[PDB]
Symmetry: C4
Subunit: 198 residues, 4 copies
């Protein structure tokens, strides 16, 4: 109940932020609904709490939190738990509201994404390529080629995603060189379909 | 009303800071008036609040906050919204009181500035060169030559400025190489008028 | 008594974290018992408190806190107090619960550990090699070879350990080049027993 | 009066820190007296307060706080105010209690010190070389040679010092190359007296 109060006080603080900056009506609605979807009536200082815990405890916890995502994904469910735990500890939780652009085509990608829950459209030049949903990942291509985004990725629904930076991706694959190929197969496949060796 | 209280408590904390360090009369006045002009009776932990929001929400917000500045400036109003949003997300809000030196001639510039509101004198050797106001930028020269300031820039009034570091400037122009020329035209023009290829 | 309250409030915050993420029964028990063993009914913002103190005061304090560990260890008890204080100021306190994996074989080691109190099994390929306890260190090998872990190290009991990063290890040994050999003797000895020049 | 309360609450927090870690009698006394000498019954979040202020306001403030030190020192009192303000903004306040070792001979120096108030003994091999007091600086030698401390420096009294890191020292002297010589004259002089070109 102090974490429900936390959320309430922090929301009243947001309300005032929005009044002061005279934020427009679509963005106040969006912010209101973002708070409810992500935090759900409670707030915690996750990284403070987790900060006070031991390494193995942070890793039981994150292994539990991403339990279903792990199982969704042959890359994880079939891998050495030490590697999954390595990658998992580097993921950042992000929520996106419907219609949001996650990745914009032709930008410099420094980030990759795994879908816990949601549907995503992959788009090039305003044209639908496929959709991706729970147990898919995207944005891997730029982590490997180290160049420009080959497609746009828009949230079609609310989306619970975990992001993984380019530096964190390489640190893990240095430690687990055998895992690199699996990403490469997927990114070659996708590069075939959209017709690129740029 | 908790953000008005925040400002009040933080101001009483400032008052005590000033008594303890026996701060002189011109600087207590200045500080008093700085608080009122920048914060306006309210305080928020902007970056905490924004921190809790999604990327796209931070970008609606900053696009809204710099809405008029964008429109003031052909560099922005005529550009690809993705680039404007890129640059915008890297800007830092600074306020300067009349008579303040923003840039001192012959220093190493690591920073550039866009004027939301205010008037600025550009000066060399104690001599007025021009004034700049709402919808101008300055300090771009050192971001490009990577050397010494070619003029002083003083605030003639209260000034709402957004600063952009040299590293952030280059990160964006790497992503948007086509935007570099527009800065270069302006900085060549200005280098002509004050007679430098140093 | 405000530090006992601190612990209590932060524990109620943890309880709620655990309910919200529907944490499983073995991990709630573990977390409960971790809090009691590490913090003992009190919490302090150590690094805030220490932050307000002078350097020499931080160093009396840490020299006192690791007083018995120093005396346990010929590397410290026989060394120049300036070097011990150098190393000591770089140590991080970690607690591990029984059965926890401190180091996993074949990972990239960036960290070394000194035992204040506890027993540890050193393991290769699921086979017991030795145990280490109060006044031992481990993980030094990867700090010197800059490669892969040559054994697993599991906590057999509760364990009060101090960790020392690879960068911090080298910064100190640059300042105290004469101390390098002592680690090298130990790591050569251990590399002999498990049969590696990898 | 909320800053006097701040100090009181933070001191009760310290008291508990000391009881819990069963800190010894000389170090509790020292800590008690350190708090009283440095903070004087009040505490402020200086860098939070200063953080909310503009650059020019931070620089009036620090120019005022180090007003007498500036005037004490030909290096400052005779220099371009822009350079003094550059250096000043990079200084960190440190207090040392009598008998404290500020610099230990033969360590790697990354830091230099200016005396606001106090007396210091400079020592080599346990032998007094000179004393330094208000308006002196020391530790400059290692900032220039980038090697080992040529003497020990002990606080003989309470000492209000401002420290300046090696990186900050070079950043300023890059911007103000003309100021380098003045340090060099002093460090050559001192290297003569203690007989070093090491
Ligand atoms: N044909 C496709 N099918 C599924 N996903 C794709 C396809 N084309 C591109 N992507 C994803 O869209 C992402 C856009 O960012 P990247 O180019 O870094 O990596 C891309 C892939 O992860
Ligand atoms: N003649 C001018 N007209 C307008 N602005 C100028 C002129 N000369 C210099 N400036 C600006 O003053 C700034 C001082 O810092 P910079 O040299 O980095 O870049 C300079 C320009 O942005
Ligand atoms: N035979 C052994 N006896 C004691 N400790 C060992 C032995 N073999 C390995 N270790 C320790 O186990 C550690 C595993 O990590 P490192 O390879 O970095 O360094 C290793 C040593 O510190
Ligand atoms: N003879 C001396 N007189 C005054 N100060 C000295 C003398 N010798 C050394 N020092 C100072 O003592 C400092 C010890 O650290 P450094 O060698 O970096 O720089 C040294 C000088 O700042």
């Amino acid at each position: 109940d102090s974490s429900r109060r936390q959320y309430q006080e922090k929301y009243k603080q947001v309300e005032q932020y929005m009044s002061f900056h005279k934020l427009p009506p679509d963005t106040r609605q969006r912010i209101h609904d973002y708070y409810e979807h992500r935090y759900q009536g409670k707030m915690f200082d996750e990284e403070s709490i987790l900060g006070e815990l031991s390494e193995p405890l942070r890793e039981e916890i994150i292994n539990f939190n991403c339990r279903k995502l792990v199982a969704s994904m042959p890359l994880f469910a079939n891998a050495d738990p030490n590697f999954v735990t390595s990658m998992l500890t580097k993921l950042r939780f992000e929520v996106f509201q419907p219609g949001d652009y996650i990745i914009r085509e032709g930008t410099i990608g420094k980030k990759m994404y795994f879908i816990q829950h949601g549907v995503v459209s992959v788009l090039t030049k305003g044209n639908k390529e496929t959709k991706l949903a729970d147990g898919s990942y995207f944005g891997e291509i730029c982590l490997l080629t180290r160049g420009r985004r080959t497609a746009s990725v828009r949230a079609d629904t609310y989306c619970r995603l975990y992001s993984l930076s380019v530096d964190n991706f390489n640190e893990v694959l240095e430690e687990y060189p055998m895992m690199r190929r699996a990403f490469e197969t997927v990114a070659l496949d996708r590069l075939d379909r959209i017709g690129k060796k740029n």
